């Protein structure tokens, strides 16, 4: 990549100023900003908080529902000793698409809304000054870019977005907006990758820099003393009875990667890191050599009001919530999160599985692979180095039993296999079409990941005995082709509106959730090779408006406000 | 003040970097954490966001009803860059009091749980290193500091706090942290006070510094174009074709503040500032010489999950809300809020009614040895919010307490000192006042007379006659009002609470306590007595949304007299005002 993903730090060589608050903001229906000057200010701006979405704030339905080009726009004070480093604009996410301007200059453009956008401003920043970040952004959907849908247009040009999939449409600045300093030759990247060696374990690392100076890779214990040291972009740290990161039981060492020259220091980045292999061996998945069972959900970046907007807040609510139901895994469903949430997740020994956005899946198609190789280099370069990361989801519900979506297919685990340093597990979650005598894709993942809804939408409610039966006649015709892999359920779940009771239970009530869930239990124990089960849905969510969907999707175990339904109790004395 | 209350601003002269984030917090329910070096860092903690209340986010009943000694740690980078200059750690609150340490070395203390607390880092920081924070915090309630209450201790020594007031005892570090760093010489407060003149204007101001440097003052408008410049401490800014800051319709002037030497400038603060005047004129309210009728709620710093934790996302849908009511007003009940809710209502133009923690002084809720200590405190706080607020255009009245005892002569004497400092604090004299609840009888009550306008909370339909009798309490409640009205005070009266409690989707035909046809019920009866009286000139309902209490018989999750749910959506009865209000 043409920038780095290193999360930003500060220290003697790097700095860092928030940019979050009030911005301004505008709406641009005629789509006339870039032709009347809006990128060296908007001309009638309302304000709008970032980190946010912008959906949920406004009491009127056409701010709400916009779709198309709106603007953001803030000021900050660049200090003078930021004078003639390395200076950039860091976007959590741009969602879904844009163009950042400073100083009223045309910076870069990108496309993806869950991944970082860095804006070089080295030529055109102002040290000692005040400065203008003006940023240009588009929410439409459309088959070449993730996630996939439409854009319909009513009869007055208003357009309103039509997703191909099952979350609303938010966007806007959802994560944090920083403008950092680096110095001239700097760390732009790095990897690491584990062996363990009976009571000792093996760091193998590359660095990669802007320039040609020596690199020096120390290596720090929890509480700061050195623990190995050596030289070169490319070597193997050893560690002495290596403590390692293990399942809800974390341990993180610091890496320090220093760029020299003589003498001093030109640079220096640290990261906490952990200790730890995956690997897939027959039917099980194994974390420091030990099988490991994954428990957990499928979760969203969801939340009254800030909509994806970030906040420590909910993830500390959501890893507490998580730890009470004895949880040790959850999926980022159906995009790569906010940073924050890995850095936590590495904190509190979660397992990730890590999705990019390729969900909603013509001439077209060649454009789509190529968002979808790029949001894929994207997200493992950034997330590689957490611990907690142990798989990658590269679909969710794609066609897979044509040829055609196997030479697609077979492109995108190639792009994540170059850039993984670690070759860790890959996959993606399929959809019940994905038929076993059909499927021509399961064959590229390392383990394969099942979402099913055998009691919900096939023979749900008082035909739940035969979706059981329909669920076991799929399962033996798994069994029977012998893959030897493991199978991980990535979904299963029942809408379930908080407070509706019923004896007999019914679809929809707390009563039919827990009954359901018994039922999937009961089969997924039945089969040697399941090796995971994540619930569709950690909470309540938002999606589209619709016939099917009541303020949302109520499949949560919690409610969207972060309080358990009957069902969390089932699942926290199962997971005991 | 020994500290500034300025809000922190970054240019030239002035610094700031954000210490939000996640921090590291420890428990200390045995209170060992001093004798034993916590302030070097704490032994097993584990993460807390900043800002939040820390209640709501763990999973157990003993770490969310936590009442005692409890800790906060971070680390933070200091450029070099700011080697001497005057650096100082800002906390836009610290609840309910604490100790502020850095790099191990005791800073400061402070006791008031919703103010900035500074503390000057300037001798024991390090530029160019890592630096640490500690924060020693104690969320107990006592009856001589505000808000009052009382703690208690379970058999085994667990503490419970026991609020004398309505509102959940949320606590921690609820506001954004900064460390800053402002010149040796700097701008440490200002005042400005307005006087119309026609078509023209005058901004009166005073500043205060730490040196003996000359000031020059700017007032740039709204396109940043100087409007009048002058120099002094203490001087008159005139302002030609003023465009003065309205209800609902504001406009912001820029204050521009220099201290300057031979060879250039020492130090710039910025601040918007909006040109109005707030009188009482009989029964009358005059913003700008013209009437205004007062159309509101007050609110609550309150949002699930993070408490009372400060977010611009809550201020945003909270506005958007109070303008699809056609509201103009709120009052800040029952704290100063966090000061990002008055720069946002200057914008909108939107009054505030700035309200002081004393709340919780009721005798029938809850003692001669600690009323001086709690007046001190008290006086304490006034001082504090005025001087942090007296500068927003929106807040047009301090409102100096919610239902204390107001009928004794000591309750008399003990006010008269609270509405004289508040008097001496504030440089444009603007309106004081407080809420009356129903026991300060117009017979009874010695206090109101320190009052430009007299507030009343009344529950006449809820606590009083509710229900099927409420035929009876409209009659009870235009029997006081008949009462006051024979009093012939010639001074406004503004309803700052009145409300019933309402579960959303609790529907009934004929209505019940706690439908939300009842909410709607309840409002137009109280709408037809307010209506009946000329001196009525404001309303200000309670509560804007539901919001957390104390567990208890008498509360159902909470407070649930909010116009709308927690999570911002309206109650039926939410139109019932937007219709009024129009
Ligand atoms: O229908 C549902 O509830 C879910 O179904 C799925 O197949 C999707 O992967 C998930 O995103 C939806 O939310
Ligand atoms: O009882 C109520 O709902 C309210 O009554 C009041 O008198 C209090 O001033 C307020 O803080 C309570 O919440």
Redesign the interface.
């Given at each position: 990549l043409e920038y780095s993903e290193l999360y930003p730090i500060?220290?003697?060589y790097r700095?860092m100023?928030?940019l979050?608050?009030?911005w301004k903001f505008q709406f641009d229906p005629e789509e006339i900003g870039k032709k009347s000057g809006w990128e060296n200010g908007l001309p009638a701006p309302v304000?709008?908080?970032v980190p946010?979405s912008f959906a949920?704030?406004?009491?009127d339905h056409k701010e709400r529902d916009y779709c198309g080009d709106f603007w953001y726009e803030t000021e900050?004070?660049l200090?003078?000793?930021w004078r003639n480093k390395k200076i950039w604009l860091r976007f959590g996410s741009i969602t879904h698409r844009g163009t950042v301007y400073c100083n009223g200059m045309e910076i870069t453009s990108h496309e993806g809304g869950f991944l970082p956008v860095l804006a070089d401003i080295s030529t055109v920043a102002k040290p000692?000054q005040v400065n203008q970040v003006v940023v240009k952004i588009n929410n439409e959907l459309n088959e070449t870019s993730l996630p996939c849908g439409a854009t319909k247009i009513l009869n007055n040009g208003r357009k309103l977005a039509k997703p191909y999939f099952d979350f609303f449409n938010y966007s806007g600045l959802q994560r944090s907006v920083w403008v950092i300093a680096l110095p001239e030759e700097s760390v732009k990247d790095y990897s690491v990758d584990y062996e363990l060696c009976g009571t000792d374990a093996l760091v193998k690392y590359e660095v990669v820099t802007t320039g040609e100076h020596p690199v020096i890779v120390r290596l720090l214990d929890a509480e700061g003393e050195l623990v190995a040291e050596t030289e070169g972009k490319e070597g193997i740290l050893q560690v002495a009875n290596a403590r390692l990161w293990e399942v809800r039981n974390a341990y993180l060492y610091q890496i320090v990667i220093l760029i020299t020259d003589g003498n001093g220091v030109l640079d220096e980045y640290r990261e906490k890191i952990g200790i730890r292999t995956v690997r897939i061996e027959g039917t099980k998945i194994l974390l420091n050599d030990r099988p490991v069972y994954l428990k957990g959900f499928g979760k969203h970046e969801d939340?009254?009001?800030?909509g994806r907007?970030f906040?420590?807040?909910?993830?500390?609510?959501d890893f507490?919530?998580l730890?009470?139901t004895n949880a040790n895994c959850f999926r980022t469903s159906h995009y790569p999160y906010a940073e924050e949430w890995y850095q936590?997740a590495d904190?509190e020994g979660f397992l990730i599985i890590d999705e990019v956005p390729a969900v909603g899946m013509a001439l077209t198609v060649p454009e789509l692979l190529k968002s979808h190789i790029a949001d894929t280099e994207e997200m493992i370069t950034r997330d590689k180095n957490h611990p907690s990361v142990i798989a990658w989801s590269l679909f969710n519900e794609p066609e897979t039993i044509t040829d055609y979506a196997y030479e697609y297919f077979k492109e995108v685990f190639a792009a994540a296999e170059t850039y993984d340093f670690q070759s860790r597990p890959m996959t993606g979650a399929f959809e019940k079409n994905s038929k076993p005598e059909l499927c021509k894709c399961y064959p590229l993942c390392d383990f394969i990941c099942l979402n099913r809804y055998y009691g919900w939408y096939i023979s749900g409610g008082p035909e739940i005995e035969e979706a059981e039966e329909l669920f076991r006649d799929e399962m033996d015709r798994w069994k029977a082709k012998e893959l030897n892999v493991p199978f991980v359920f990535t979904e299963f779940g029942t809408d379930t509106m908080a407070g509706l009771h019923k004896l007999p239970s019914i679809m929809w009530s707390e009563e039919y959730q827990k009954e359901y869930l018994e039922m999937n239990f009961r089969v997924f124990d039945s089969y040697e090779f399941v090796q995971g089960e994540l619930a569709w849905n950690f909470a309540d969510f938002q999606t589209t408006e619709g016939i099917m969907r009541v303020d949302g999707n109520h499949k949560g175990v919690f409610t969207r406000?972060?309080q358990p339904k009957a069902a969390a109790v089932v699942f926290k004395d199962r997971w005991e």
């Open positions: 500060q220290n003697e700095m100023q928030s979050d608050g009030m304000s709008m908080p946010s949920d704030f406004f009491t900050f004070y200090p003078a000793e000692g939340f009254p009001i800030l907007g906040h420590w807040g909910i993830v500390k609510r507490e919530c730890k009470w936590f904190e406000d972060r």
